[PDB]
A = this chain, B = another copy of it.
Amino acid sequence: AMVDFRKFYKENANVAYTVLGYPNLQTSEAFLQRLDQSPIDILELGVAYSDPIADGEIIADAAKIALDQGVDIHSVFELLARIKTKKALVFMVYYNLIFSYGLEKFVKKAKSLGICALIVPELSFEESDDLIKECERYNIALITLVSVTTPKERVKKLVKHAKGFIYLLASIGITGTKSVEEAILQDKVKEIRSFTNLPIFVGFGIQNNQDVKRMRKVADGVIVGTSIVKCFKQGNLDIIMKDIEEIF
């Protein structure tokens, strides 16, 4: 059946992002096997396909390492067969990796393996049509992405037919200031709320247990990415889970 994300958390959703294969597939495996006893309610599975470009940064370096490990979508798929979790699993992949696997085939494997949604960075609404056909047909939500810089009428167009949840991007520097920049964020939650009853998860900029407890007061969920990936830098699952535990 098509996913109801309100089913995966009570008060506010803990959302995390990880790069599969960082620093190795067996670490991801063990991580996924302990997902049930982490505070993470929803896990975005980052899958590397190409190397990143003008960069040098946290998510980008994990992804290249994951690549050298011989990690790819197929090993990921294979791993997903071996995992058992009650938590929601959500792919986060570039369109190039879908295009190359085949759109229907990809959506079909993802579904078959417990994935309940896709986020496809940089795939705009206007380009999403065919991927939309396929997701609908197999009951998988293709996540609609909104920002605080998205004007009101485009918000409306984008959320009218959205499924799963609304990915809301925050800012840390529209003003430089913070008292104000949270109120700017609150208003945009409020615009969204009046066009969809979907839960709204807020990400970008969220770095420690203090940004989480704060962000908790803003919407229906909190997404922590780069800080999660930093935790895997270490070589010891016990400690990675404790960090995650603190962060949440």
Contacts and interface: CB of A to CB of B under 8 A. Distances in A.
Interface in A193-210: 203-207
Interface string A37-63: 000000010100111111111111100
B149 A54 contact: no
Nearest to A145: B53
Contacts of A44: 54
Contacts of A176: 65
The contact size tier of chain A is 35 or more
Q: Which 5 A-B pairs have the closest CB atoms?
A: A54-B225, A55-B225, A51-B147, A65-B173, A55-B226
Contacts of A206: 55-56
B124 A100 contact: yes
A169 B207 CA distance: 28
B204 A149 contact: no
Contacts of A145: 50-51, 53
Contacts of A119: 53
A41 to B, nearest CB: 16
Nearest to A94: B122
Contacts of A67: 147, 149, 173
B148 A68 contact: yes
A224 B64 CA distance: 18
Given A52-B121, A55-B225, 14 more contacts: A51-B149, A51-B204, A54-B92, A54-B121, A54-B204, A55-B206, A55-B226, A56-B227, A57-B58, A65-B174, A68-B148, A95-B127, A100-B126, A122-B122
B205 A55 contact: yes
Given A67-B147, A94-B122, A149-B64, A56 B172 contact: yes
A27 interface: no
Interface in A175-194: 176
Contact of A54 (B53, B56, B59, B126): B59
B126 A99 contact: yes
11 contacts: A51-B145, A51-B169, A53-B119, A53-B121, A55-B203, A57-B57, A61-B173, A64-B147, A64-B171, A68-B149, A122-B122
A36 to B, nearest CB: 23
A123 interface: yes
A103 to B, nearest CB: 12
A223 interface: yes
